[PDB]
């Protein structure tokens, strides 16, 4: 709030040098955590945990190639540490080679009092910064972000409860985990208030800086003290060591980058190069019996022949794919995206699949008619009240329709890419 504007103007200035928004924001985060540590030494007494010689006061004293060297040394030592600090500084790395322009970020962070602010305030500034980068049409940070309105509706439908484990195995900025924690925190303790605190959440992302942003975000909203729920791993690489109650995820829509290690997963139902089918497999394999998932996936997952069908067959047999939400265009960073939310539990077969079409004749964009949480109110009510809106003769254009599993098994390729609403 005016602090946000100052953060945004330093962003364009570094952009003026060769320094992009995502890089700026990681360096801002590295510096912010360090400053806040120092503040906590005055504001509440105790000894720092940051090594001696590398605290905030040591940093601000240098100016030249010397400033850049001290900063880099500082990031090296912190990355070597454990728990929350080590997570914030995961494979930490300076991207600002220019002393003058680093000193500007340092100087801006130094001049405020971060501990003291309303605490909600730090959260909301950070969420606001993450979003403005995330919906930046030519910055491509949207690959690291999901719109909050949609996360909220998903968490509301899944309805996580105190005592459950929640995992997002492709966590980006940590929005699902942040929202599921807020949802659970306001419910009726104490083995379980402590469970939420220490044991409920887990997030995985393979990209170091994104782990830095996620672990900071969770921390700035009061999630954790000395430990982070976020780990830096490649989810597809390894069979999961622990099964969970709830999965919440928006996995990458893009291909696995070239030169990434080849995966070796005998536990998978089928070998495929489709990155999204593999995330879907990995997540099905991650659930406990009785567990449930809500996951954002592309249309391709619903129609693709070969491996896709094999997996959709497995999904119908051993899981209850009770709900598919068809998402509108114009809500993700890179619009065009044809996406869907699939909700399913593990154990029981699918007998019926309820479709909610929020795509056909729906018009959102990032600049005008923005998606907000109230647009998914009807969906959420349908989710809870399993009474068909569609009727062949009374309401053929109704958004909520139930299909028995036998019609789906009878479709070509076992396709789940079903619509029925005439645009006309
Ligand atoms: C669309 S983002 C998730 C956004 C998140 N829902 C939020 O609140 O910001 C997808 C994430 O998956 C990560 N990712 C890509 N490949 C991965 C992999 N193999 N293992 C774990 N994470 C991966 C990306 O780095 C990216 O942050």
UniProtKB/Swiss-Prot annotation:
- EC class of this enzyme? transferase
Gene Ontology MF annotations: DNA binding; N-methyltransferase activity; site-specific DNA-methyltransferase (adenine-specific) activity
> Known SUPFAM superfamilies for this protein?
S-adenosyl-L-methionine-dependent methyltransferases
Q: Does the keyword Methyltransferase apply?
A: yes
What does the protein in this record do? The subtype gamma methyltransferase (M) subunit of a type I restriction enzyme. The M and S subunits together form a methyltransferase (MTase) that methylates two adenine residues of an undetermined sequence. In the presence of the R subunit the complex can also act as an endonuclease, binding to the same target sequence but cutting the DNA some distance from this site. Whether the DNA is cut or modified depends on the methylation state of the target sequence. When the target site is unmodified, the DNA is cut.
Task: Print the miscellaneous field.
Answer: Type I restriction and modification enzymes are complex, multifunctional systems which require ATP, S-adenosyl methionine and Mg(2+) as cofactors and, in addition to their endonucleolytic and methylase activities, are potent DNA-dependent ATPases.
* Family designation: Belongs to the N(4)/N(6)-methyltransferase family.
- Protein name, please? Type I restriction enzyme BthVORF4518P methylase subunit
What species is this protein from?
Bacteroides thetaiotaomicron (strain ATCC 29148 / DSM 2079 / JCM 5827 / CCUG 10774 / NCTC 10582 / VPI-5482 / E50)
């Amino acid at each position: 709030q005016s602090l946000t504007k100052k953060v945004w103007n330093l962003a364009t200035t570094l952009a003026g040098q060769g320094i992009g928004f995502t890089d700026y924001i990681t360096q801002l985060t590295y510096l912010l955590f360090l400053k806040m540590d120092a503040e906590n030494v005055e504001m509440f007494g105790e000894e720092s945990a940051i090594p001696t010689g590398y605290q905030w006061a040591d940093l601000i004293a240098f100016d030249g190639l010397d400033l850049v060297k001290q900063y880099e040394e500082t990031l090296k030592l912190l990355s070597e540490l454990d728990n929350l600090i080590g997570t914030i500084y995961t494979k930490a790395q300076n991207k600002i080679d220019k002393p003058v322009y680093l000193k500007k970020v340092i100087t801006m962070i130094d001049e405020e009092q971060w501990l003291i602010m309303d605490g909600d305030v730090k959260g909301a500034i950070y969420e606001s910064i993450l979003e403005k980068n995330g919906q930046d049409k030519k910055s491509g940070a949207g690959q690291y972000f999901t719109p909050r309105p949609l996360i909220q509706a998903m968490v509301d439908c899944i309805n996580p409860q105190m005592g459950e484990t929640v995992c997002d195995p492709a966590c980006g900025t940590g929005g699902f985990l942040l929202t599921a924690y807020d949802y659970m925190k306001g419910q009726s303790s104490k083995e379980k208030r402590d469970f939420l605190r220490d044991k409920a959440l887990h997030g995985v992302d393979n990209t170091p800086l994104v782990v830095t942003l996620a672990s900071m975000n969770l921390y700035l909203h009061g999630i954790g003290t000395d430990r982070s729920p976020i780990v830096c791993e490649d989810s597809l690489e390894k069979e999961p060591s622990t099964l969970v109650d709830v999965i919440l995820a928006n996995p990458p829509f893009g291909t696995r980058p070239a030169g990434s290690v080849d995966i070796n997963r005998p536990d998978f139902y089928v070998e495929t190069k489709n990155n999204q089918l593999n995330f879907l497999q990995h997540m099905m394999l991650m659930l406990k019996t009785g567990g449930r998932a809500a996951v954002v996936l592309p249309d391709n997952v619903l129609f693709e022949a070969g491996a896709g069908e094999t997996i959709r067959k497995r999904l119908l047999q051993d899981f209850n794919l009770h709900t598919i939400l068809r998402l509108p265009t114009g809500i993700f960073y890179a619009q065009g995206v044809k996406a869907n939310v699939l909700f399913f539990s593990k154990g029981q077969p699918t007998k019926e699949i309820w479709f909610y079409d929020y795509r056909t004749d729906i018009k959102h964009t990032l600049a005008t008619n923005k998606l907000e949480r109230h647009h998914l109110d009807d969906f959420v009510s349908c989710y809870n009240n399993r009474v068909e809106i569609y009727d062949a003769e009374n309401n053929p254009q109704g958004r909520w329709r139930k299909y028995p599993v036998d019609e789906i098994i009878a479709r070509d390729k076992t396709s789940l890419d079903i619509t029925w609403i005439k645009p006309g």
